[PDB]
Design an enzyme around this catalytic site. Sequence first.
Site, PDB file in Angstrom:
ATOM      1  N   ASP A  39       0.844  -1.188   0.000  1.00  0.00           N
ATOM      2  CA  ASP A  39       0.000   0.000   0.000  1.00  0.00           C
ATOM      3  C   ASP A  39       0.883   1.244   0.000  1.00  0.00           C
ATOM      4  O   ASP A  39       1.969   1.229  -0.588  1.00  0.00           O
ATOM      5  CB  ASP A  39      -0.932  -0.049   1.229  1.00  0.00           C
ATOM      6  N   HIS A  69      -3.515   6.038   3.910  1.00  0.00           N
ATOM      7  CA  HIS A  69      -4.315   4.887   3.491  1.00  0.00           C
ATOM      8  C   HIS A  69      -3.698   3.578   3.978  1.00  0.00           C
ATOM      9  O   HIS A  69      -4.378   2.745   4.591  1.00  0.00           O
ATOM     10  CB  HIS A  69      -4.465   4.959   1.969  1.00  0.00           C
ATOM     11  N   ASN A 161     -14.193  -0.050  -6.141  1.00  0.00           N
ATOM     12  CA  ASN A 161     -15.186   0.910  -5.667  1.00  0.00           C
ATOM     13  C   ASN A 161     -16.000   1.500  -6.811  1.00  0.00           C
ATOM     14  O   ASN A 161     -16.377   2.674  -6.793  1.00  0.00           O
ATOM     15  CB  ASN A 161     -14.521   2.028  -4.868  1.00  0.00           C
ATOM     16  N   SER A 224     -11.136  -1.091   0.092  1.00  0.00           N
ATOM     17  CA  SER A 224      -9.849  -1.056   0.772  1.00  0.00           C
ATOM     18  C   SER A 224      -9.950  -1.345   2.263  1.00  0.00           C
ATOM     19  O   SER A 224      -8.977  -1.806   2.870  1.00  0.00           O
ATOM     20  CB  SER A 224      -9.249   0.341   0.656  1.00  0.00           C
TER      21      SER A 224
END
Length: 279
Positions: A39, A69, A161, A224
């Site tokens: 990530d 994130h 998403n 996520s």
Amino acid sequence: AAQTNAPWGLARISSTSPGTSTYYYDESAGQGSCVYVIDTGIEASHPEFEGRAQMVKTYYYSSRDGNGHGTHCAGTVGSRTYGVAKKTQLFGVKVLDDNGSGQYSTIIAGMDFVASDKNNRNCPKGVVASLSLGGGYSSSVNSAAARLQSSGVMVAVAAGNNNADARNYSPASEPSVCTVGASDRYDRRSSFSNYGSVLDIFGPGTDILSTWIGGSTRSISGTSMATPHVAGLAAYLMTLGKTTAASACRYIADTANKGDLSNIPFGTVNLLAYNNYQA
Ligand SMILES: [Ca+2]
């Protein structure tokens, strides 16, 4: 063990019904397992990680999470307050820049890095990789995810998403990994969550409180956020001896809460991750 006033998503994965706020789990808490969070990085100094998080690789000028994130996802895996597997070891691989973006070649390199690097780490109970990222379909990206799984790592990936069929996103569309959709606290499919026959499981993904950079916390939404719930659950189950890296996705699907989510398009599994813990 019982953690009261937990984030709703931790309560949800330890429960047969929505609407409760206590997380119930075996005290072993993923000790002896390892989870790679691939990530934007991890703020390893955050008190919530207790010295159990390390950056092991970056493809940028720094290994710092300048975004948040990756720190948030890692917190859902394994932070003391916000995490599923509160005693797991977390390893950060920074494949995304501080804007949250990354070239596919760098993402691929990060996956093959984990396949090798696990041989440099002590993970007697097993190894998991959490990939809260994706983009358009790429056979090379899917192949890299399949290699990582084949190498003996439980690979959990976000469905995306796009409120669309995940078969058109990578690594979501790779059949051999564990593709994770998102649900909300009322057992609805999250409105942004991708769907389709390539999904294996759903986890909590709307309004998820976890760690953030600067030693802080916040609540954000996405597939996520659902993915690290499943990655942490796999690590927890591997420590308990209930499954292995090769079998964990099927085990999670077999033991999930079934038929409890709403707005599940026809052809998509109606399965919600569940730890099946009875104190
Ligand atoms: Ca699978």
